[PDB]
């Protein structure tokens, strides 16, 4: 599923991401835009052999099991394929564990390089929330 901007904002707010660990909703929408272009089915392979999955590009070396990343830790206790669903619940629940890990949203390289320090409220402007 490819979300619309406001549709994704509303879904993330319903799943408790707005101001989660102090990160306003615009931060999460911005991260999803540049990680996946709002596409729940996005996958990308990393140089170390791990793969990133879903709307927030969660990595198989630490967070989910894809059966082909040796020595991976599966900290969200899910198959990585569950992160590609049109239902974003699994991605949101795992993202909450990632952002609580000590480094905040800096875990998402696209957020650090393209969202951090910008006017992220622009990403929810006009939305009925
Ligand atoms: Cl915001
Ligand atoms: Cl990740
Ligand atoms: Cl933080
Ligand atoms: Na893993």
User: Number of folded domains in the chain?
Assistant: 1
What is the DSSP-derived secondary structure letter of residue 125? T
- Kindly report the backbone phi and psi dihedral angles of residue 70, in degrees, each rounded to the nearest multiple of 5, phi listed first: -60, 140
3-state secondary structure of 50: coil
Query: How far, in Å, CA of 35 to CA of 29, rounded?
Result: 10
CATH number at residue 52: 1.10.530.10
Query: How far, in Å, CA of 11 to CA of 49, rounded?
Result: 31
- State the structure-solving technique: X-ray
Catalytic residue among 35, 66, 87, 119: 35
Bridge partners, residue 53, by sequence: 43, 58
Angstrom CA distances, 11 to 62, 63, 64, 128, stand at 25, 22, 22, 12
Residue list, CB under 5 A from ion ligand 2: 58-59
3-state secondary structure of 88: coil
Q: Tell me the ligand closest to 17's alpha carbon.
A: 1
3-state secondary structure of 12: helix
- Angle, helices 25-36 vs 5-14, to 10°: value is 130
Alpha helices, H only, the chain: 5-14, 25-36, 89-99, 109-114
Known binder of ligand: residue 18? Answer: no
Read off the tokens for 10.
């509303």
For this structure, is 7 an active site residue?
Answer: no
For this structure, is 35 an active site residue?
Answer: yes
Which domain does 90 fall in, by range?
1-129
């Amino acid at each position: 599923k490819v979300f619309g901007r406001c549709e994704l904002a509303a879904a993330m707010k319903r799943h408790g991401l707005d101001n989660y660990r102090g990160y306003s909703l615009g931060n999460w929408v911005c991260a999803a835009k540049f990680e996946s272009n709002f596409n729940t089915q996005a996958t990308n392979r990393n140089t170390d052999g791990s793969t990133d999955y879903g709307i927030l590009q969660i990595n198989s070396r630490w967070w989910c099991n894809d059966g082909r990343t040796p020595g991976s830790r599966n900290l969200c206790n899910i198959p990585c394929s569950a992160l590609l669903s049109s239902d974003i619940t699994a991605s949101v629940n795992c993202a909450k564990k990632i952002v609580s890990d000590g480094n905040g949203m800096n875990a998402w390289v696209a957020w650090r390089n393209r969202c951090k320090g910008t006017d992220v409220q622009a990403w929810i402007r006009g939305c009925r929330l």
